[PDB]
Ligand binder design. Structure first.
Ligand SMILES: [Cl-]
Ligand SMILES: [Cl-]
Ligand SMILES: [Cl-]
Ligand SMILES: [Cl-]
Ligand SMILES: [Cl-]
Ligand SMILES: [Cl-]
Ligand SMILES: [Cl-]
Ligand SMILES: [Cl-]
Ligand SMILES: [Cl-]
Ligand SMILES: [Cl-]
Ligand SMILES: [Cl-]
Ligand SMILES: [Cl-]
Ligand code: NA
Ligand code: NA
Ligand code: NA
Ligand code: NA
Ligand code: NA
Ligand code: NA
Ligand code: NA
Ligand code: NA
Lengths: 105, 105
């Protein structure tokens, strides 16, 4: 019930990227889901601002929003993409594609 | 109407920190507010995962949430705190307290 990494399988044609991504068809991107509320967990790595804003949200729930559970570290995947000549080319480390860690920010 | 930094003045007794923070009474913490939706802005620095998840949210709005507008860089403030001897001590760089930049994550 707190900020944590959970599964998210993404299909590239569902998001309109199949026009340039030949392969893979789908990959595990994960997502960060869960609440940022007190008491927090031991491993969500909360920033001081995320802690402060969550406290302000308690006192003023209609004015200030709470902190958000988001990726704090991302990992690459490899993709096979068509280049300007229609030739399948490998992008070995397409960065920023999969969640490695989540946290409250 | 997009991810951007906006004002947020925090009062320490409102959040229960006045028991250990003698001064200042209030500070400008800012907050990151705005939507992460297409078309994005030129300066929100979106990660590839935040872009992918926003596209998945369009196709499956009830299953996957959108990306979140969050601080991507924080700045310190100085605080005057009482130490274990009841003596006011200065913490020159209390890190992570104020928003320097926002972005979609
Ligand atoms: Cl806590
Ligand atoms: Cl911090
Ligand atoms: Cl590329
Ligand atoms: Cl590479
Ligand atoms: Cl390598
Ligand atoms: Cl890349
Ligand atoms: Cl765009
Ligand atoms: Cl990225
Ligand atoms: Cl301290
Ligand atoms: Cl310091
Ligand atoms: Cl200095
Ligand atoms: Cl610090
Ligand atoms: Na309120
Ligand atoms: Na609000
Ligand atoms: Na490219
Ligand atoms: Na390698
Ligand atoms: Na849906
Ligand atoms: Na949802
Ligand atoms: Na301390
Ligand atoms: Na200085």
């Amino acid at each position: 019930s707190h900020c944590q990494k959970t599964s998210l399988r993404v299909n590239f044609e569902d998001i309109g990227w199949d026009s340039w991504i030949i392969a893979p068809k789908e990959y595990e991107a994960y997502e960060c889901k869960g609440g940022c509320f007190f008491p927090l967990a031991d491993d969500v790595t909360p920033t001081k601002h995320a802690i402060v804003q969550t406290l302000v949200h308690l006192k003023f729930p209609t004015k200030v929003s709470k902190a958000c559970c988001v990726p704090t570290k991302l990992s690459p995947i490899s993709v096979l993409y068509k280049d300007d000549m229609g030739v399948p080319t490998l992008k070995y480390h397409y960065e920023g594609m999969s969640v490695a860690e989540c946290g409250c920010r």
